[PDB]
Design an enzyme around this catalytic site. Sequence first.
Site, PDB file in Angstrom:
ATOM      1  N   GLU B  10       0.769  -1.243  -0.042  1.00 45.40           N
ATOM      2  CA  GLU B  10       0.034   0.434   0.061  1.00 45.40           C
ATOM      3  C   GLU B  10       1.228   1.120   0.299  1.00 45.40           C
ATOM      4  O   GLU B  10       0.678   1.779  -0.342  1.00 45.40           O
ATOM      5  CB  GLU B  10      -0.711   0.069   0.854  1.00 45.40           C
ATOM      6  CG  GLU B  10      -2.572  -1.061   1.299  1.00 45.40           C
ATOM      7  CD  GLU B  10      -3.824  -0.134   2.234  1.00 45.40           C
ATOM      8  OE1 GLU B  10      -3.128   0.772   2.640  1.00 45.40           O
ATOM      9  OE2 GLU B  10      -4.296  -0.711   1.049  1.00 45.40           O
ATOM     10  N   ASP B  19      -6.842  12.560   1.028  1.00 44.55           N
ATOM     11  CA  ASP B  19      -6.292  11.462  -0.327  1.00 44.55           C
ATOM     12  C   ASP B  19      -7.027  11.741  -1.374  1.00 44.55           C
ATOM     13  O   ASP B  19      -7.609  13.176  -1.276  1.00 44.55           O
ATOM     14  CB  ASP B  19      -7.119  10.757   0.143  1.00 44.55           C
ATOM     15  CG  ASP B  19      -8.319  11.031   1.341  1.00 44.55           C
ATOM     16  OD1 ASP B  19      -8.796  11.932   1.041  1.00 44.55           O
ATOM     17  OD2 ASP B  19      -8.961   9.717   2.054  1.00 44.55           O
TER      18      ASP B  19
END
EC number: 3.2.1.17
Lengths: 263, 160
Positions: B10, B19
């Site tokens: 990740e 984000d």
Amino acid sequence: MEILNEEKKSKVHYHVAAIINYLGHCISLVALLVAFVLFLRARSIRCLRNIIHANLIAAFILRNATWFVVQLTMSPEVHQSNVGWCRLVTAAYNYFHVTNFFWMFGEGCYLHTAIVLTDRLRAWMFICIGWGVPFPIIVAWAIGKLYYDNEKCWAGKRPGVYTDYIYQGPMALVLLINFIFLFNIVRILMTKLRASTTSETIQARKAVKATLVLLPLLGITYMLAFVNPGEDEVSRVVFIYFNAFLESFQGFFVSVFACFLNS
Amino acid sequence: NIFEMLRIDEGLRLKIYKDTEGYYTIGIGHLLTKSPSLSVAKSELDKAIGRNSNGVITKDEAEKLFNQDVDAAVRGILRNAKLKPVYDSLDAVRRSALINMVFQMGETGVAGFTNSLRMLQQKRWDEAAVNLAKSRWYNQTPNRAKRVIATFRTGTWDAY
Ligand SMILES: CCCCN(CC1CC1)c1nc(C)nc2c(-c3c(OC)cc(Br)cc3OC)c(C)nn12
Ligand SMILES: CCCCCCCC/C=C/CCCCCCCC(=O)O
Ligand SMILES: CCCCCCCC/C=C/CCCCCCCC(=O)O
Ligand SMILES: CCCCCCCC/C=C/CCCCCCCC(=O)O
């Protein structure tokens, strides 16, 4: 006269040292070969830490096999001739010497990481540090030997040149960093993990204990390369024989160390 | 090992970032606040990190946040009646692969793999592996999926 008989005696003790040195290197090489195939056989060859061990063993096999080839360059005719294959043998031997230091540093880095952070991808980092970083260092040193000290198959000792620091300095520096790793591992093992029993903790105290046993064994060898022995007959012969036994069994000690950490 | 597993497939960031949807996040995907003000973002942060206020954290700091998110995830796994029994039956390595899937697609995403999950609980790992691979998931992030699947099939860390 009495000088000559004192000269013949030394030839005996030097010839005896040489025999200790060939014997030790043959025993070490067989011990590393046995330890190598043992590692390759186990299914545990796919864990990161056994990949590290096997590459470490390989690096010591190459250095100890190359030592035999080096002996064929210590001929005075070859040594003075500075023939091309003669310098390539010396560079290969120093390269392997540097990979021995950098793979031990690889072992220290993994041990410090295994207790602070909870395999085939991560291995490439250790492969790159152990086999990779020494390659440009040795190239750099060889460019140095070419323009400032191109003699004696690059294995000369000449006062004032420091061309060899190019590869000796990196060696001392990774040793210095492994000392910091060791203090923090001991520091962490003795404060926070004093009551712990994760699998990687048990096996880590085994490492620390084995590293503390091996470290003086290997350390004497390197400090003695700085002593001037002295002219006492007892002093010379003992210096020469102790050094030949310790240098030549290094490979043996390391194979014992590595197999111990397999358990 | 599980920290390095997720770091690998990740990623790890050490300074706070927004984000795809615009919220403040840090570490291995730890969301801090949907509040648009950075004030609340860095505030909630130090309340969590309880260290000298800042927007950079320690690699050490990331793993402590990461461990909080691992907890929340296992809590959600045990609350889910299709996931609880598979989890309880698996060894530590294979549990890690299940936590990995939950990080990527959430609990209800993983519950949809009904055939595969019954394979896994029947410790029947070859044929689970072929099921997991006929899926849009495998097709979209195929490198991550191959690593997670091989970990189910062998129960070792060999692929990471
Ligand atoms: C064989 C060629 C070089 C070997 N060599 C030199 C010896 C004379 C001191 C060496 N070089 C380097 C970089 N580290 C080490 C260690 C070592 C360590 O040392 C502080 C700390 C930790 Br944590 C792990 C360690 O090894 C698993 C040892 C025992 N030896 N050693
Ligand atoms: C699996 C274990 C069996 C391994 C057999 C291979 C042994 C390798 C030995 C190599 C030694 C190199 C030759 C050294 C001889 C020096 C003798 C001399 O010069 O006087
Ligand atoms: C016509 C005879 C001339 C004399 C030639 C004597 C030298 C013959 C060559 C010997 C060594 C052969 C090459 C060895 C290189 C090994 C390199 C390495 O292992 O790192
Ligand atoms: C099992 C992996 C082994 C990796 C070995 C690869 C590198 C081996 C290198 C051997 C010789 C290194 C010395 C190169 C110096 C080049 C300059 C010169 O000698 O003229």
